[PDB]
Amino acid sequence: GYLLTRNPHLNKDLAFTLEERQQLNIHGLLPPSFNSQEIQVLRVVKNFEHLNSDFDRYLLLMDLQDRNEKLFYRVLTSIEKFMPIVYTPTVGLACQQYSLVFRKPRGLFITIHDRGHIASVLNAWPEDVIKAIVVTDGERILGLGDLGCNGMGIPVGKLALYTACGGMNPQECLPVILDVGTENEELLKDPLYIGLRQRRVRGSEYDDFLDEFMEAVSSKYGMNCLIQFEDFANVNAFRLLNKYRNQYCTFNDDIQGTASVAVAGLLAALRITKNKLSDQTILFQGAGEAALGIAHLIVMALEKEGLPKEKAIKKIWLVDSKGLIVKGQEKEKFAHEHEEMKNLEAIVQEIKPTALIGVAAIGGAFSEQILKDMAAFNERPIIFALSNPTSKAECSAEQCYKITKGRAIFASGSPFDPVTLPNGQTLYPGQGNNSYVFPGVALGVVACGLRQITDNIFLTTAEVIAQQVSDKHLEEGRLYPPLNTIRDVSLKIAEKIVKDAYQEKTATVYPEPQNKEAFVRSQMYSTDYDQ
C-alpha cells in the first residue's frame, strides 16, 4: 500500500485504477479522481508552463522523476521541448547550483577517500543489474569548467535521455560522479559545498583511482556493462578513452558522439551537393577533442569509399589557437607542408575548403568575410557551427543564410529558429545534437553484448542517421532527421549495430534472435504503467 506510493518505479498517482486502490489498500491516500496518463501529462505540462524559469522547470521534472518515473519519461517522450530542460543547456545551470539546490540524491558519489574500497561503495546501490553507466569527475562541464561534485547533474540528465530517446531501462542505469577534489575557488569557499573540500588529486594517485573504478564496475556488473565518460578535461578524456576502450565496454560521448553526428551531417550534405566525400576539402576551426575525433572518423569514411589513409588525411586541415597546423602529437598527423598562418579569413582564402566546421568554442569566428568567401569558392558551401551554447557559435543561421544568399548548407550544435529567405522558402537548420547518437549506440551495444565499442560502429551510426534524412527534409535545409523522431532513429541505429554484430560474431548475447528489429524493441522501455 502506502509503500508502493513511495516507490517511484511503480507509483501511478491518480492513474491508480479504482480497483487497484482497493486491492492495494490505498483507497483514501488519494483524492477521488482517476486520471489516464494523458490527463496526468496535461497537468504536468500546465505546471511546466506557468513556471517562471527553465531552471524551475528542471526542478519540477526532476521532482517528478523522483516520484513517478513512468510519468516522468512519458512527459519527456511527449523531447524537443523537454530535452533542453532535463539536459544541456539547463542542466549546466543546475550543476552550478547543485549545492544550493541539493534535494533527493540520485546516483553514486565515489570519492578518492574510497580508493581500495570502491567495490563496497557500489554495494550501496539498490539496483543489481546495471547495463549503463555515465561518469564524470566534474572537471569540464560544458563551458562552465570545473564544478567538482556539483557535476552529478550531468550523468543524471544524460541517462534520462538514454531512457527517453533510446529506451534504456532507467532501473539499469547508474549515474556516477568521481570526486577527487575541485579547483573551483568559490566552491572550496562555500560552506554549502557538498564535495570534498580540497584541490584535485592529479597524477598516479588519480590514474589508479580510475583503474580501480573500471575494475570494480566491470566486476560487479560484468564486462558488458557500458561505461560512458563525460565532461572530463581534455587530456584525461583522451588518456582514459584510449587506455580503456579495448578492455572495457566504453566510450566518451564528447569526442566520439560528436564525431558521429558531425559526420552524419556531412554524409547528409553530400546528397545536396551530389558529389563524393573524396571531392571535399575540410577545414576545422578548432583542433581539440571534437575536431580530432571528427577528422579521424571522416578519414575512416574516406577509406571505406576506397582511398588509402595517406591520400585521405591530405583532404583535412585543422586550426588551433596558435594558428593553422602545418609541418613545423595527434595534431601532428594532419600537419601538412604549408606556410604557417594565423588569420582565419586568410586561411579560408588560401585553402578554399568545401566544408567548414567550427568546434572551437569561439563565437562569431565565421565572419561575413569568411561566409562571403565560402559562398564564392563553392556553389553550396557546407558550414557547421557546432560549438555550444548559441552565444559561442561560429555564426547564426540567419547570418549564414543571409550572407551566402541562401546557398549555404548549414547545421549547428545549438538549435536555431527556422529562417525565411527573400525567396519565400523557409529553411530549418538542423541541430548537431549528440543525442542522435548515444542513445541508439548504447541500446545496440548493450542489446547484443558488444564488449568494445569501435570506431566502426560510430561510422555506421553516422551512416544510419544520414540514411534517415528524407529528400523532403534536405530540401527544407535539414541535415538531420526531425528531433521529434529520435526514438525511431535510435531504434534504426540499434538495429544496424545488432544485425552487424551477429553477422560478424561480435555479439555475445546468445541465442541469436531470429528478428533483430523485434529483438531491439524487446529491450526498449515503455512509458506505459506495468499491470
530 is in an annotated binding site: no
Which among 87, 244, 248, 436 is annotated as catalytic?
Answer: 87
Number of residues that bind a second copy (CB under 8 A): 54
Alpha helices in 306-363 (DSSP H): 309-313, 344-351
**Residue 219, interface with a second copy (CB under 8 A)?**
no
Beta bridge partners of 358: 285, 385
Query: Does 9 interact with a second copy (rule: CB under 8 A)?
Result: no
Are the CB atoms for 398 and 383 separated by under 8 Å?
no
Find where cell 479504482 sits.
Answer: 18
**Alpha carbon distance 466, 459 (integer Å):** 11
Only segment of 84-92, 195-203, 338-346, 522-530 that touches a second copy (CB under 8 A) = 195-203
Helix pair 37-50, 69-77: axis angle to 10 deg: 70
Pick one of 23, 80, 116, 123: the residue that binds a second copy (CB under 8 A): 123
Question: Beta 419-420 vs 409-412: how paired, if at all?
Answer: unpaired
Binding to a second copy (CB under 8 A) within 373-402 occurs at: none
Residues 48-107 within binding reach of a second copy (CB under 8 A): 50, 52, 56, 63, 67, 99-105
Contacts of 160 (CB under 8 A, 6+ apart): 65, 72, 76, 86, 87, 170
Helix, strand or coil for residue 109? strand
> Which of 82, 193, 221, 251 contacts a second copy by CB under 8 A?
193
At its nearest, how many Å lie between a second copy and the CB of residue 204?
A: 22
Q: Does 205 bind a second copy (CB under 8 A)?
A: no
The whole-angstrom separation of Cα 149 and Cα 138 is 6
Distance CA 376, CA 425 (A): 22
| Integer Cα distance of 91 and 104 in angstroms | 16
Q: How far is the CB of 21 from a second copy (least distance, A)?
A: 8
303 is in an annotated binding site: yes
Active site (annotated) includes residue 87: yes
300 is in an annotated binding site: yes
Residue among 386, 353, 381 nearest 282 (CA):
353
The label of the residue with cell 550572407 reads 403
By residue count, the chain amounts to: 531
Question: Would you give the binding string for a second copy spanning residues 154-183, x where CB under 8 A is met?
Answer: -------------------------x----
Told to judge if 58 belongs to the known catalytic residues of this protein, a careful annotator would answer no
288 assigned to a ligand binding site: yes
Q: What is each CA distance from 316 to 15, 254, 271, 353, 366, in whole angstroms? A: 56, 21, 20, 9, 18
Q: Kindly identify the residues of this chain, within the stretch 440-459, that bind a second copy according to CB under 8 A.
A: none
Residue ranges in 23-52 that form contacts with a second copy under rule CB under 8 A: 25-33, 39, 42-43, 46-47, 50, 52
**Annotated catalytic sites, by residue?**
87, 158
* Binding residue ranges for a divalent metal cation: 230-231, 254
* Binding residue ranges: 140, 230-231, 254, 286-303, 388
By CB under 8 A, name the binding residues for a second copy. 1-2, 5-6, 14, 25-33, 39, 42-43, 46-47, 50, 52, 56, 63, 67, 99-105, 108-111, 113-114, 120-126, 149, 152, 179, 191-197
